[PDB]
RNA sequence: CUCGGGGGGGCCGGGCCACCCCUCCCACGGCGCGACCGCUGGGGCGGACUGUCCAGUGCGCCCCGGGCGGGUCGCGCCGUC
């Protein structure tokens, strides 16, 4: 009788992000520096 | 002027360049300023993340400032057998 499909009407939404974006080069680079400082700092503390 | 023959100056108008002053546009080069593009420390808000010391790193919007680079445009001055 009626096989036509009425598409679901789209509704605008508030911008929401549900997953992390990529870390930048600076963030990745600074992370290694913090890890290096943390390692040496722990070594000095132990001695 | 020289022995009819021979040698010269010419005839009067216009514009132009030299001389002395200003003056329009264009081209090229330089200097300075300005506008916009435009390369690139500080502050505020929001948010995401990192570090085996509380510290640190991007991102979104806004407000400034410096170093000083180029381009487009517009001026002002200088130079050009």
UniProtKB/Swiss-Prot annotation:
The modification Phosphoserine is found at residue 24. It comes from the Eukaryota. Residues 10-20 have a biased composition (Basic residues). It is found in: Cytoplasm; Nucleus, Nucleolus. Residues 5-47 are annotated as: Disordered. Component of the large ribosomal subunit (LSU). Part of the 5S RNP complex, which is a LSU subcomplex composed of the 5S RNA, RPL5 and RPL11. Component of a hexameric 5S RNP precursor complex, composed of 5S RNA, RRS1, RPF2/BXDC1, RPL5, RPL11 and HEATR3; this complex acts as a precursor for ribosome assembly. Interacts with isoform 1 of NVL in an ATP-dependent manner. Interacts with RRP1B. Interacts with IPO5, IPO7 and KPNB1; these interactions may be involved in RPL5 nuclear import for the assembly of ribosomal subunits. Belongs to the universal ribosomal protein uL18 family. Component of the ribosome, a large ribonucleoprotein complex responsible for the synthesis of proteins in the cell. The small ribosomal subunit (SSU) binds messenger RNAs (mRNAs) and translates the encoded message by selecting cognate aminoacyl-transfer RNA (tRNA) molecules. The large subunit (LSU) contains the ribosomal catalytic site termed the peptidyl transferase center (PTC), which catalyzes the formation of peptide bonds, thereby polymerizing the amino acids delivered by tRNAs into a polypeptide chain. This is Large ribosomal subunit protein uL18.
């Amino acid at each position: 009788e009626n096989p036509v499909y009425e598409k679901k009407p789209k509704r605008e939404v508030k911008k929401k992000r549900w997953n992390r974006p990529k870390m930048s080069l600076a963030q990745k680079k600074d992370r290694v520096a913090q890890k290096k400082a943390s390692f040496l700092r722990a070594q000095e503390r132990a001695a």
